[PDB]
Design a protein around this nucleic acid. Structure first.
Lengths: 306, 78, 85, 346, 54, 108, 105
RNA sequence: ACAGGAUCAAAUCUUCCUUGAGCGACUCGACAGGCAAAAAAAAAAAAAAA
RNA sequence: GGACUCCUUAACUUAAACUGAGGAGUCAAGUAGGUACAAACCGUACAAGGAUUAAUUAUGUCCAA
RNA sequence: AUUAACAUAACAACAU
RNA sequence: GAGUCUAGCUUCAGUUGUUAUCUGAUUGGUAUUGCAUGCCCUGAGUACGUAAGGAAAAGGAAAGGUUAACCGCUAUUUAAACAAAAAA
RNA sequence: ACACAGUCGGUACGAAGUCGAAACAAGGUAGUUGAUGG
RNA sequence: UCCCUUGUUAUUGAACAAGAUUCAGUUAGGAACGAUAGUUCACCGUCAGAUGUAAUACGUGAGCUGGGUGUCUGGAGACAGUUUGUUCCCUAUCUAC
RNA sequence: UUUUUUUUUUUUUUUUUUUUUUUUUUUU
RNA sequence: UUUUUUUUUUUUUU
RNA sequence: UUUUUUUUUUUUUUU
């Protein structure tokens, strides 16, 4: 809450106050204190669907691969995603799971909200979302989600909000052609929209007409690829691009339709969740398998005129 | 363009109230609150106006003597 | 629509609450509209008499004397058949 | 913030709402508001008599005109008829009756006489009046270079507010042409104070605008000559004094205390100009939270048959009168006057 | 209370006829004291709507 | 104009006239204690009426008797052993036998 | 109420190959508040307003918990129930010789 | 809510019935926050104590 | 030195609301009714005036009525 | 001193 | 009475198109494909045909083009140049 | 107000009582009930 | 049923490949330039995007213009953006002994 | 350090994403 | 009459 | 075979 010129100097000076990097291990062992007693393995069915996850956009990065091809990947962090409540047909009328994410100061949370958290036995949350899934994939209350839910090398469905650009013109928003810069052209005609309708035969402008206005701030969805995951820090690297600001909430789910059919067919995935067995170690870091063929192979393409 | 017809009284009447609310919510209300804050601080004294202006003061008067307990004036000395 | 003026016959068709599929057929001629229903146009057989509902009042006496068909379409043996206008 | 109004403000609309503000919804909303409003009052459970307000001069004018209308003559005339006003006639047929200012003066004298007579009655502590009584004053201010549009904005703001409050409201504007109104306000306050009325109980009733004229000027253009003019309006204001009875009911019950008073109180408290005993005394009128909790406790007490309206009114009036009397006594003593002079003055 | 109820069984009945009949009841024209200004009708309940014919 | 007839449009209208065509409706104060009624009497009103019958020698009407009997009959299962004696003694003193004695024999 | 909006939309469902089950549905189709667009008459108003008195009158007349409950149930839809109404019913229920707490009524 | 009720009566840990669907779910009852200063692409960031 | 319709008929592409003739109605200068929506068609015991009444007409009789 | 157009205010209303 | 998350309704085009009988302790019982420009590869020098000549079922990929999103890399433009020591 | 901003028409007090309801009949006593084998 | 993409498999003087006429949908995805200015047509050269029609007042001139076979600062409709609220401007004063 | 295409990524979902509105309240 | 049914068919004549 | 027509303002075809 400082001044402009104080904030600007802060922005520059922040770099000098960075804590040392953690120490990442090669192996991980879990005990009974991190496992839901109610958690068990369930065989999937033909009409079974899994749950989604929430993430925060951190930033972009470039990473190599086994063949040596560089790719751009976005980093996402699951900020302690925990199940709050469940929905049943008898109780509510539909199967769903409610989850929470984030943290809020106690000096900002209302009493009715704090009542929920007391029951839940969890710290205050910033955001709450819900997922629709099949009845056979209802996770127990209080279970903490992990990055291990998605296996590397599978297609994911990512949803989020776009950025904001304020007010923009017709030429700026849509990308109109306009008029020439010369050859006897009026000032106003430079960036004018031109015809916007028909003659007296149609006295009404059709709905959904492309016009000037505030731009940005819309929902958008995109496909992504799981490139790398981290268990320690709970990090996920997604191949492609994700909308929203560097910190905005984003939803991640499995493939749907063609995406599933074509890609997510031969990939074994833990349907309910990751279920570690007490007394056994697990990897910390998992990488995407390399391709089959050499990417750096330029065969000959015949060019014959006829 | 040019107007095709005359505006009725009703419209004008409506507009009046619209405008009044618009202004009140954005000018007057802000100004009032800004004005009222200065009370805590001593009044403003201008150097330019010193030729005619009264001496400086700090103490504020009480407009409502009815709800003013405690002594009001001091007895004259011998 | 965009057209300013339209024929009354076309307009009539335009007002029919039916699917596009049947609309097309109706327009073509394969189908007719009558009594709020859609049915096959009447069949005119060579030599046989036409329905009494399509001839003029003075032509009914002569139409009733002509031969009549009391069989199925498969059993029909007419040299030529066409829809009656 | 710093040279920029907040972007996230909320501007009210009197004719539209995102939650719906249709005709049908208006009815319901109004009904509920009225219902809630009505219930906020606290009437006494026991009264001896109810005395209403009436204007003798206004009744006499109607009585004088009714006889002329129905009989066609004047009071006492037995030979002659009524002559109405005619074009070019200098004589006013209704010249015997008083004017508005004279009737207001008669009212102001009658209310003083009634106030003096009130002390004789022994059962004056259990008598109802309602609303309407009080002295009335009227002023005027002409030659104002402002139109109706401009005038209305200010007028509506100042309407239904305390004399002192209005001054502040107009002052806060930081405008130039508002000085004309400011001067009228200040002159009215000074005149009312000199007339002996209590300026602490004086409220703005209503207003009135009168068109005076226009001053046109030439304005040349490329292919025409427009006419530029100036506005001229006159503002008429009305003031009314709130009796003790009325005053009590509005501050104690309704809790519709002005802002100036509360600001003064808070100022004194913050500056330590008073002791610890005054905070509690002003608790009913200090802050909005205290007012609300006080009103809720009042309602509970009332329902419990624990609260005495007449007793609270008497305590209120006695405290106010004692403070007013002590102010004058101390002011007189400050000059060093003798005991005989003090006794004769008060 | 003055509120009357009519529960019908529309099983194998014609939509048009049923509608026509219902209209009468809804309108309240069947009563002597019919007022077009107001709704003088009575509540109507219909079941087995799936069984209609055309 | 229109597809239909314009004249064939019945309009509601009164066939007579009277002074009560514009009498406003208002909610009058509602009784706070409805139990005070003999019809809707209670154990207290029953006992009070029984005491009054034993005190006075007045010859009451048939209606009173009827109503009193019916109420008692209705509410027979709520009476106390002490109140039953009073209610039966009232009847015995007034020489009335309306089937009351048989009904009270099941609850006594 | 110059204009009262009310439309029956085509809701999502699956009626194809429907099997007749002798069971009640979830709930009523129509739930929207019914708002009249006309001023009521004297008789209408009276019928609408008589409940306030009839409730108490029948409560008083009642001679058993069954009757009490029934009476209460009948005036279910009756909005704007004053506190004292509850008190009255409670007193009557206690006088009648108790009641069934478990009762839906 | 194991809150109420029946029975020659229940594994630890209610055999069975009622609560119309325990008010759509949770929670609160001094609950909740419009405007001002300051900050402010959406959004987030201040415990109280002049 | 006339606009629509009925019978006859000249011209035209047996075309056009055209151009022009013979003899009846209506409008022009006609109300209200019917014909779904804008003079010309049907009917009229066809509009001095007022009211809470009865009738075979074009024509209608499942709902809007 | 003075009509209308025009400008402002007060009172009056409940089957809503 | 109030806070959160939600049921129903609404949504570019458009439809009503789904389950008799029922492995006897013998590794078990339909399953996210609506959709579609051109050129190249496997199938294939195969079907076909004297010869020349030369297909489909399925998948895989390199250009061009449209929409949307974003600033990890490259290109254009452009801004900033300030508080580690409690001996300071 | 949907209206070229109009015209016609426009609300039927009591029981909101009750120590009534007796000179119909019956009566599971409710100031209850009157026809009807599809 | 509109130039290409669909109707495995019988309309064919259809061996394959490449082709011609006709019909059908729950209406799905697409179709690049230049020179001469003879108001537009046969034809000409390149990428081969692979034989590429009409209506809407020339569709469109209070949005723009050109070598001939005028001006206008948007009052109401429509369309594209935006709207705290029951209260937080003012006012809203029973019953009657 | 910011903006942009001259760079990069997707071309999937439509009972989906999303949303301003809890409705047994028939005369506020 | 049988989910046989992109322009392909069977059974029975209702 | 008939009642049901341009009923072509809407619903409906209940025979």
């Amino acid at each position: 809450y400082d001044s402009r010129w104080v904030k600007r100097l802060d922005r520059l000076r922040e770099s000098k106050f960075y804590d040392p990097a953690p120490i990442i291990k090669e192996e991980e062992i879990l005990e009974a204190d991190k496992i839901h007693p109610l958690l068990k393995k369930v065989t999937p069915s033909w009409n079974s669907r899994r749950t989604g996850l929430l993430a925060y956009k951190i930033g972009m990065m470039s990473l190599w691969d086994g063949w040596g091809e560089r790719h751009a990947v976005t980093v996402c962090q699951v900020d302690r995603c925990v199940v709050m409540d469940q929905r049943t047909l008898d109780k509510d009328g539909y199967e769903a799971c409610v989850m929470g994410i984030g943290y809020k100061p106690i000096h900002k949370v209302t009493k009715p909200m704090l009542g929920v958290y007391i029951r839940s036995q969890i710290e205050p949350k910033s955001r709450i979302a819900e997922f629709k899934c099949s009845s056979d994939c209802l996770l127990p209350v209080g279970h903490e989600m992990s990055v291990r839910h998605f296996t590397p090398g599978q297609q994911v469905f990512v949803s989020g909000w776009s950025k904001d650009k304020g007010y923009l013109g017709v030429k700026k928003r849509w990308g109109f052609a306009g008029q020439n810069a010369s050859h006897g052209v009026e000032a106003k005609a430079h960036s004018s929209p031109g015809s916007i309708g028909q003659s007296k035969t149609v006295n009404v402008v059709w709905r959904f007409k492309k016009m000037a206005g505030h731009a940005g701030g819309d929902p958008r969805v995109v496909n992504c690829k799981v490139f790398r995951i981290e268990a320690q820090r709970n990090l996920i690297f997604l191949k492609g691009c994700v909308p929203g600001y560097k910190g905005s909430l984003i939803k991640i789910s499995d493939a749907r339709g063609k995406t599933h059919h074509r890609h997510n067919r031969h990939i074994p995935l833990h349907f309910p969740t990751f279920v570690p067995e007490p007394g056994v170690s697990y990897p910390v870091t998992l990488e995407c398998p390399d391709a089959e063929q050499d990417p750096f192979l330029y065969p000959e393409i015949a060019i014959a005129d006829k | 363009a040019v107007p095709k017809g005359k505006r009725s009284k009703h419209k004008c009447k409506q507009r009046q109230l619209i405008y009044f609310f618009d202004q009140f919510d954005g000018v007057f209300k802000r100004r009032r609150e800004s004005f009222y804050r200065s009370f805590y601080n001593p009044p403003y004294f201008s150097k330019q106006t010193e030729q005619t202006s009264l001496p400086p003061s700090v103490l504020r008067p009480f407009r409502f003597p009815g709800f003013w307990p405690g002594r009001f004036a001091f007895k004259m000395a011998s | 629509g965009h057209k300013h003026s339209e024929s009354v016959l076309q307009q009539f068709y335009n007002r029919l609450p039916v699917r596009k599929r049947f609309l097309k057929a109706i327009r073509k001629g394969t189908l007719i509209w009558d009594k709020g229903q859609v049915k096959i146009p009447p069949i005119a057989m060579q030599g046989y008499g036409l329905p009494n509902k399509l001839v003029l009042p003075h032509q009914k006496e002569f139409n009733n004397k002509l031969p009549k068909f009391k069989g199925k379409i498969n059993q029909l043996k007419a040299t030529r058949i066409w829809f009656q206008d | 913030s710093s040279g920029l109004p907040n972007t996230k403000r909320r501007i009210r609309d009197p004719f539209w709402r995102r939650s719906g503000w249709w005709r049908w919804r208006q009815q319901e909303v109004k009904a509920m508001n009225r219902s809630r409003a009505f219930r906020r009052h606290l009437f006494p459970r026991f009264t001896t008599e109810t005395v209403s307000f009436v204007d003798a001069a206004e009744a006499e004018a109607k009585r004088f005109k009714e006889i002329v209308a129905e009989t066609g003559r004047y009071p006492g005339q037995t030979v002659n008829f009524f002559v109405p006003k005619v074009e070019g006639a200098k004589l006013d047929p209704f010249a015997a009756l008083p004017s508005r200012q004279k009737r207001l003066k008669l009212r102001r004298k009658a209310v003083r006489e009634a106030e003096e007579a009130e002390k004789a009655r022994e059962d004056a502590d259990f008598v109802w009046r309602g609303k309407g009584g009080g002295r009335v004053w009227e002023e005027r201010k002409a030659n104002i270079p402002l139109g109706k549009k401009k005038l209305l904005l200010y007028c509506t703001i100042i309407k239904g507010l305390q004399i002192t409050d209005a001054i502040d409201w107009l002052s806060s504007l930081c405008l130039h042409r508002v000085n004309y109104l400011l001067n009228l306000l200040n002159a009215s306050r000074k005149k009312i104070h000199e007339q002996g009325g209590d300026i602490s109980r004086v409220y703005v009733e209503s207003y009135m605008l009168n068109i005076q004229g226009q001053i046109k000027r030439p304005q040349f253009r490329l292919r025409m000559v427009n006419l530029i003019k100036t506005w001229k309006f006159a503002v008429v204001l009305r003031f009314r004094e709130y009796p003790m009875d009325e005053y009590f009911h509005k501050l104690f019950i309704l809790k519709h205390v002005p802002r100036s008073l509360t600001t003064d109180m808070r100022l004194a408290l913050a500056g330590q100009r008073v002791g610890l005993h005054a905070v509690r005394d002003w608790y009913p009128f200090l802050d909005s939270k205290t007012r609300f909790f006080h009103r809720k406790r009042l309602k509970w007490l009332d329902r419990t048959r624990q609260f005495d309206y007449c007793l609270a009114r008497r305590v209120f009036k006695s405290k106010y009168e004692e403070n007013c009397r002590r102010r004058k006594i101390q002011v007189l003593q400050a000059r060093g006057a003798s005991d005989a002079v003090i006794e004769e003055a008060n | 209370s003055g509120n009357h109820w009519h529960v019908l069984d529309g099983k194998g009945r014609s939509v048009g006829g049923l509608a026509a009949q219902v209209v009468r009841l809804l309108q309240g024209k069947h009563r002597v004291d019919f007022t077009p200004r107001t709704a003088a009708g009575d509540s109507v309940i219909v079941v087995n709507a799936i069984h209609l014919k055309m | 104009g229109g597809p239909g007839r314009a004249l064939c449009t019945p309009t509601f209208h009164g066939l007579s006239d009277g002074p009560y065509r514009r009498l406003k409706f208002s909610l009058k104060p509602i009784r706070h204690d409805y139990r005070d009624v003999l019809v809707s009497a209670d154990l207290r009103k029953l006992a009070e009426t029984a005491q009054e019958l034993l005190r006075g020698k007045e010859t009451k009407r048939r209606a009173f008797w009827e109503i009193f009997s019916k109420r008692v009959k209705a509410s027979a299962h709520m009476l106390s052993p002490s109140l039953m004696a009073l209610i039966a003694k009232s009847f015995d003193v007034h020489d009335r036998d309306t089937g009351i004695y048989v009904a009270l024999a099941t609850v006594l | 109420f110059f204009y009262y909006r009310f439309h029956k939309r085509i809701g999502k469902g699956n009626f194809n190959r429907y099997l007749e089950f002798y069971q009640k549905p979830r709930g009523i189709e129509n739930t929207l508040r019914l708002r009249y667009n006309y001023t009521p008459t004297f008789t209408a108003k009276k019928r609408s307003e008589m409940w306030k008195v009839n409730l108490v009158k029948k409560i008083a007349h009642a001679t058993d918990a069954k009757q009490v409950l029934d009476v209460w149930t009948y005036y279910r839809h009756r909005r704007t129930k004053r506190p004292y109404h509850y008190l009255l019913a409670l007193q009557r229920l206690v006088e009648v010789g108790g009641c069934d707490p478990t009762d839906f009524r």
